[PDB]
Design a protein around this ligand. Sequence first.
Ligand SMILES: Nc1ncnc2c1ncn2[C@H]1C[C@H](O)[C@@H](COP(=O)(O)OP(=O)(O)OP(=O)(O)O)O1
Ligand SMILES: *[C@@H]1O[C@@H]2Oc3cc(OC)c4c5c(c(=O)oc4c3[C@@H]2[C@H]1O)C(=O)CC5
Ligand SMILES: [Ca+2]
Ligand SMILES: [Ca+2]
Ligand SMILES: [Ca+2]
Length: 342
Amino acid sequence: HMIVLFVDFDYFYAQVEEVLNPSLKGKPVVVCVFSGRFEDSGAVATANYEARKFGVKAGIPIVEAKKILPNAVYLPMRKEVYQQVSSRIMNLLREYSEKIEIASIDEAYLDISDKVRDYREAYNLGLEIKNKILEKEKITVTVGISKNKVFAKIAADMAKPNGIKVIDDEEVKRLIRELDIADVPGIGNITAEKLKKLGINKLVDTLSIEFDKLKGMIGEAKAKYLISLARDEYNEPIRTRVRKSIGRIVTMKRNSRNLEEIKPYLFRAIEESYYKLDKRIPKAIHVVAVTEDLDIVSRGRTFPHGISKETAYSESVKLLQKILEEDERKIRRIGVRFSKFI
DNA sequence: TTGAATCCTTCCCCC
DNA sequence: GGGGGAAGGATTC
Ligand SMILES: Nc1ncnc2c1ncn2[C@H]1C[C@H](O)[C@@H](COP(=O)(O)OP(=O)(O)OP(=O)(O)O)O1
Ligand SMILES: *[C@@H]1O[C@@H]2Oc3cc(OC)c4c5c(c(=O)oc4c3[C@@H]2[C@H]1O)C(=O)CC5
Ligand SMILES: [Ca+2]
Ligand SMILES: [Ca+2]
Ligand SMILES: [Ca+2]
């Protein structure tokens, strides 16, 4: 059948910052995103392994991080820079197979199904690829390999960082039963829970309960997806993918409800969203408001034509008003999202 | 306590 | 009964 090759750049942002300034290597680096809310307000985009060893990881606020390693190198996030370093590594990959996916800013699956006869040769192509990526861009990555996407990724998760691992059918059969279901791609702790108090603690357990029970607890989708992984029938193609929407949000200095106070933030958001749009014309626009208590509320509108920057501002203001109206909390975060491209 | 981008489920129109 | 689609909330990486 087929063999999937998953490539995953190690502690990426942090690493890219290390590449752009080698003096950093071997020292704990925490790449964070600072919100003008107050000094050191914000969170950790991510951190390299030195820093991570001690708990400073992605998601923890910057203040807690400095309390753990008050002496680590803290750098602001430079997405653009990372975006270009990624694009570069992404191309090198295309050279190994035109069947590439690119799931995120540091992930990509490759159907080397043809370019390889056996796993032995896959493992080889893995090193070939790790090495060529290390030579051209100075970036270390983990590579996973198996019969399908989901497993090619799991193989990687197991081998981080700067690793390479092949999961053969026997490794799969073993995993379908001994692999914790919370560690399966697509299962956030939210679904990991509903599955926990349902008896499904292992990828296999999904076979025991009747289907229409799962469909109601976690949804027809996740239901069928899980079942196939368990009966070893899962086999999704490595399809190239196109961005289906762009957007931008911004935290405000103070939380408020004053339309006029929020407007400037909204527009700042819209303005950047267009730059990103580049040459794309969106037919749908949505305004997203993160309430003072971190709950998300969004209103939107789809037009039968493209959205001009001018109209964009206009329709955005209405949609925010509609939010303040329909809600009551103070707005903490505001922004826009443009979808349904022409 | 920082974004971004893609699903899950109502719901309204109408053959 | 169900094709076709827009809205807002849910969930994941
Ligand atoms: N919780 C988060 N908050 C903000 N940015 C995040 C978060 N998680 C991930 N990111 C961004 C920062 C990273 O550079 C990139 C994600 O990297 P991730 O691929 O999942 O693994 P990584 O290789 O950088 O980490 P790892 O140390 O596990 O290998 O996406
Ligand atoms: C939205 O607001 C916060 O910003 C981010 C950014 C992430 O990745 C770039 C992110 C991830 C995860 C998560 O639970 O939260 C975030 C958040 C916060 C969200 O609440 C993951 O599991 C992977 C990335
Ligand atoms: Ca990674
Ligand atoms: Ca990744
Ligand atoms: Ca998980």
